[PDB]
Every structure is written in C-alpha cells, then in structure tokens.
Ligand binder design. Sequence first.
Ligand SMILES: CCCCCCCC/C=C\CCCCCCCC(=O)OC[C@H](O)CO
Ligand SMILES: CCCCCCCCCCCC[N+](C)(C)[O-]
Ligand SMILES: CCCCCCCCCCCC[N+](C)(C)[O-]
Ligand code: NA
Length: 429
Amino acid sequence: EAPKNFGLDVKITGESENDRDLGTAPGGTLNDIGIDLRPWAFGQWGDWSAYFMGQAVAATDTIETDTLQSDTGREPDKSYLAAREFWVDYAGLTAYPGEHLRFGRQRLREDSGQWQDTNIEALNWSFETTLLNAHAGVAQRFSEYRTDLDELAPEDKDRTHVFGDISTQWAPHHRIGVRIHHADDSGHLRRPGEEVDNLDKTYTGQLTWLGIEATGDAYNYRSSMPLNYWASATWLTGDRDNLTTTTVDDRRIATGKQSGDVNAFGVDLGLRWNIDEQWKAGVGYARGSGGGKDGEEQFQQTGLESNRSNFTGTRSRVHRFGEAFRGELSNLQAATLFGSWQLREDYDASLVYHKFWRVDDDSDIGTSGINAALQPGEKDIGQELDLVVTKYFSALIRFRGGLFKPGDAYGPGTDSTMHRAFVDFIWRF
Ligand SMILES: CCCCCCCC/C=C\CCCCCCCC(=O)OC[C@H](O)CO
Ligand SMILES: CCCCCCCCCCCC[N+](C)(C)[O-]
Ligand SMILES: CCCCCCCCCCCC[N+](C)(C)[O-]
Ligand code: NA
C-alpha cells in the first residue's frame, strides 16, 4: 500500500496493416511484431510530486506501440529510446486533492479524446471535485524526446496551445460544461520561389475552439443509468494563412499565401443503451464541417487529439472514428453503430460499425489512417467494422481490429478492403 515509487510496463505488440495507401503506392504493408518497455519513476513529498516515464522500443518494423505517437529527419527507426513523460506537480494551491498544478511533459487528456489526448510539454492546472470540474493549461512541443526523430512535425513547430474548460454535475451523473482551446502559430511559411519540403508548414493559423458539452456517463463504463449519452457542439473560429505551392521539375515551389477567416462547426452526438450488466449497445453521429466560402467552414481538431474514448461503454478505449480509417472530425460525417459486452473487469468486447461521408466534394478531409487521394465530386468515403476484445489478468491481452471498406470517393485502382489490426499484450510490474 506504500505509494509505489517505480514500475515497469512491458508490451508485446504485433500489428497487421494492409494496405494504408489502398494499393496505390509501393509496399506500405505492416505485419510485424515488437516489444515496448516503459520504466517509470514517481516521488511524492507532501504537496509536491514528480514523475518520469521512459520508453524503449524494439520492433521488426516501424509498427505502432503507442496510440499517442506523433505520426510520421522524420523517419522513425524500428528501435528507439524515448522520454514519454517528465513533470513536477504541486497540489497545495487548494485543500482539494483533486486540484493540482502539473509542469513538464505530461499526459493531457479529456474524456472524449477529441480535444486533447497526448503527451506534450505543458503547465496544466486541474480542479476536479464532485460538483465542479475546471482545467486550464498551456502546451507546446519543443522536441519529440526520441532517438530516431530529429525534427518536430511542421504543424507542431512553434505552435502554442492554450486551453481551458469548466463543467458542473447539474444532475447525478449528468454533466454540462464549456471548453475553450486556442492554437497560435508563431512560425513562418516559405517565401515565394522557395523549395518546400515535407517538414515546411502547410499553413500558419490562429485558431480558437469554443465547445459546449453535455454528457451523462458518456465514458463511464460502470454506469448505473440505463441510458448514457454524449452531446457536444464546437465552434472553430480564427484565421489561417495557407501556403500555396506549384511543381517545377518534380519539386514543389512556394508561390505565396492567402489569409482567410475560419468559421467552422463540429457536432458529436451519442446514445448508449445499458441493456444489462454485461451487454451494451449504442449509436453515434459526428459531423465536422467542410468546404464553404474559401474553405471558411473547414473544421479541424486541435492537433493534440487522439479521438479515442470509452464510448462503447467498456474499460478498453476505442477510436471514435475507426481503428482503420482513424478519421479526424474535419469535412467529415460519421454514423456509428456499436454493440459491446463486458464481464466484471475480466473481459470487455466491442463491435463497432462506421459509415463515413464527406461534407464537401472538392475539399479534402482531415487526417486519417488512409493515404489515398479522394475523387472530386464524391461523398461516399466508405464503411468500417471494428472489433476490440480484451482480457485483463494489471496485465492485459487485447486485440484491436479495423476493417475499412473504401467508398466511391477512392475510385479505380484502389483496394476494395483495407485492414489494420493489433494484438497488444501488456504486463505491469
Ligand atoms: C440529452 C441530450 C443533450 C442535449 C442534446 C440535444 C441536441 C441534439 C439532440 C438530438 C439530436 C439527434 C440527431 C440524430 C442524428 C442526426 C442525423 C443527421 O442530422 O444527419 C443528417 C445530416 O444533418 C445531413 O443530412
Ligand atoms: C534500462 C534502464 C531503464 C530501466 C529502469 C528500471 C525499470 C524499472 C524497475 C522496476 C521493476 C518493477 N519492480 C516492481 C519489479 O521493481
Ligand atoms: C494482428 C496480428 C499481428 C501480426 C503480427 C505478425 C508478426 C510477424 C513478424 C514477422 C516479421 C517479418 N517481417 C519481414 C514481416 O518483418
Ligand atoms: Na490539494
């Protein structure tokens, strides 16, 4: 019971992925295994505490051993070292032990995973009581802290994140709240005539997300309520200066840039039936605006998101928009069916169906686990069936599977079916 100062996380991960590009580019296939050692240290002295977690990975190929990876001077190696988290924490600001201030590289996380779920350098203030939850923090990436990555993602470079939220429990297990997030770019874009690589930035933006959120045990997998729900509306405002480019002799040259106001809208609705103590089923609809006058309605998430939550009502967390498609709520429309089952804390299982549309036929969608160009004039992105099965021993064995059936929007020459699967075996000392 003595508060544990250190431990080690072991994970054997094998991943099957075929094919990310829908057979348009050479290779790009995964069918590889790896191990991921994560030692962690923790100290606590009254109101003060400190924590470090490192990461050692060795794999047969650049497989994904971390759902919070920065997606890829930016070519990762099959094996690498990494400092995932390092932070100091003070909790003596108030007598509420749910209140604390955390400084360093830390796990920023909100329940839906659509606003922030990542490890990033930040100073975050958390205030979590029964009646009132409030968070405030500032974050920015200065490095990946890994032996195989030299540079930041262009989007992370010189981007500062400020964010805050406040919510109350107006009814037992019913939460209403507001959430704000601001992303500011201090970087520069390539001047006209300049060669632009893959690590130059697409744009520089001053973006602000204004969110309403109503939840009723939306991500509480032990809900005593027969019905759980999540509902959120988010307004994205600000401006973007997008870099315009042109190709001269198989190399892209900067041609200028255009400024433009962003006035987008994002909605995510969900209802989960608690049929009995084991079986649960539910429905979701999430829409990210896209297109509009000069792209003004192109919604986009914060860049810190993971879009992974326990929306299926299980202890295991599932990607909100498919483990294969991994859609970002951007120019995106999603209808989601899911059934889930769980036996105490020994097992949980989830079967999730998705269908994806575009909002605008000439506008690309946000990030995804699919690297295939979209046909102009076509909304039908495709369908996806997911299956997550987990057995908890601390330790756990988990299969995450996504089967993506591309729609008409991907067109000729593309594979009729793409899958991404994982078998995660985790052990805690
Ligand atoms: C307890 C709830 C908290 C308060 C929340 C109240 C506001 C939303 C309530 C129901 C929305 C249900 C909408 C059902 C799904 C909509 C499907 C849809 O709209 O897709 C068509 C699209 O708009 C293009 O045609
Ligand atoms: C190889 C350098 C990093 C490894 C640091 C040590 C790993 C953590 C050791 C804790 C082992 C867990 N336990 C409970 C058995 O002590
Ligand atoms: C969902 C199951 C995950 C499949 C894991 C398969 C591991 C096979 C590892 C063999 C590595 C050989 N090679 C050339 C592919 O790196
Ligand atoms: Na406290």
